[PDB]
Amino acid sequence: LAIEITTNSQEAAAKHEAQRLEQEARGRLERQKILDQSEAEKARKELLELE
Amino acid sequence: PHARRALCLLLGPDFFTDVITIETADHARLQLQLAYNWHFELKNRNDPAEA
């Protein structure tokens, strides 16, 4: 038991760091979805002007 | 503990093809072959005490 507690603690911390990578990834995933939609709408301006 | 025996103390650079049995924080028992690039050092190669 006193060694399984150590295994659980280290694996939990690594799971949290894996969630860190995942959540930071999803975070700028959102922002870059956002910025590319920015450029798309910037020229959808010309789309709908000329359409 | 006591396998080799020779009359001469090799001072020149050499190595030890040693393998250890280590365990990391994830308890991962792994053996690993080492070298230990070593060499004896003598600043004054005539002094009886240091020699």
Side-chain angles (χ1 to χ4, degrees):
Chain A
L1 305 180
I3 61 172
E4 167 76 17
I5 60 170
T6 295
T7 81
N8 290 338
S9 162
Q10 54 88 31
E11 73 91 18
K15 181 199 73 177
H16 312 143
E17 191 63 26
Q19 290 175 351
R20 285 281 57 54
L21 291 189
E22 151 63 28
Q23 174 45 62
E24 188 74 27
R26 182 170 50 241
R28 80 285 185 275
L29 169 146
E30 289 301 328
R31 322 182 299 104
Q32 293 176 357
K33 274 182 175 170
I34 290 307
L35 271 171
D36 293 286
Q37 287 168 81
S38 300
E39 300 316 293
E41 297 297 331
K42 283 168 174 169
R44 169 165 292 125
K45 160 193 179 291
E46 293 294 328
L47 265 291
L48 289 176
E49 284 189 351
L50 297 179
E51 203 178 334
Chain B
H2 296 322
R4 217 183 80 206
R5 44 190 323 177
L7 279 299
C8 63
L9 182 71
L10 278 173
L11 320 175
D14 203 313
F15 60 93
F16 309 130
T17 182
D18 171 30
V19 66
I20 313 164
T21 300
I22 67 176
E23 206 168 324
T24 192
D26 308 337
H27 304 88
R29 285 187 195 177
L30 62 93
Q31 89 175 0
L32 71 169
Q33 300 213 349
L34 271 294
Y36 314 139
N37 204 336
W38 65 277
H39 85 293
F40 274 104
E41 176 165 336
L42 302 164
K43 64 178 75 65
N44 190 0
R45 262 156 171 244
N46 60 51
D47 171 74
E50 169 178 57

